[PDB]
Design a protein around this ligand. Sequence first.
Ligand SMILES: *CCC(=O)Nc1cc(Nc2nccc(-c3cn(C)c4ccccc34)n2)c(OC)cc1N(C)CCN(C)C
Ligand SMILES: O=C(Nc1nccs1)[C@@H](c1cc(F)ccc1O)N1Cc2ccccc2C1=O
Length: 271
Amino acid sequence: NQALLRILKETEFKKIKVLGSGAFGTVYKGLWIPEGEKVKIPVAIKELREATSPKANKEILDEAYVMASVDNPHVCRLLGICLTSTVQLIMQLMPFGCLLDYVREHKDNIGSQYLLNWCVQIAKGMNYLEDRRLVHRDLAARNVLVKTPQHVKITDFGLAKLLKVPIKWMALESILHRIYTHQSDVWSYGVTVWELMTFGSKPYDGIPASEISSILEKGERLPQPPICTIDVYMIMRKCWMIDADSRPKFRELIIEFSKMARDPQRYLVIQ
Ligand SMILES: *CCC(=O)Nc1cc(Nc2nccc(-c3cn(C)c4ccccc34)n2)c(OC)cc1N(C)CCN(C)C
Ligand SMILES: O=C(Nc1nccs1)[C@@H](c1cc(F)ccc1O)N1Cc2ccccc2C1=O
């Protein structure tokens, strides 16, 4: 469906300032000024480094059409694309940033209701992606954007396969065998929840990435966050089982966290 994706000209968007760096390009804050329109729309612009992919623009545009057809409240959608010597991707701006920086900036004012609400919404977005046969591969708190404090969306899924490796978020079968499934995303979701329950701590802080596979093979896992009760830590612990098919499904994670969101004081102990 070609109509869903905007083909932009260089004069239809302007970069204002730099938001951050991705794995393959810089993300800017900018304005989208559609031709023959009286609108100037705040957007996020990601410009890929030139000649970083082997695929030509014809194949990259075909892949971008898929990213422009997702229809879910908790999943980001590609708005436009500009095909010059470099590819430039345009998306709606999320004014509050990524969820990792948000829980760090607002650590003192975040209660149990917010945290369990985020776990449900992320599992809903991931469950929609599994239904659409899309594998994320890079699910982390840095890739969960905040449109408003209680409305989050998942971004940058399928980026590796559509075109330096995030070891501390990957399932063990992905580290050892380069296998990426929807159950492989369940592992990363478990780490993402761990980032939120610790209010943005770094997983395996101080441990080199080359030792991570040895640590997981020994049986070590991320420690229990202090605010988590035993019922909450066991779920994220089950996301880290060696057998990917013994991990919980996203449909089950939605139900488990939704029930806890009914009685948030019973499951998260926050001062
Ligand atoms: C933790 C990363 C982050 O996203 N930080 C911020 C994001 C903002 N808005 C926004 N909107 C849509 C898409 C993105 C985006 C997507 N990708 C892949 C990104 C990579 C790096 C950075 C942004 C990316 N971002 C935003 O708008 C106000 C602000 C921030 N932060 C918190 C400001 C940090 N920076 C200025 C130092
Ligand atoms: O554009 C993206 N992120 C951005 N952040 C700031 C501005 S754009 C990212 C992406 C966006 C989205 F809504 C959903 C899934 C995604 O994978 N995509 C899409 C795409 C298509 C073809 C080649 C590269 C990319 C690529 O990197």
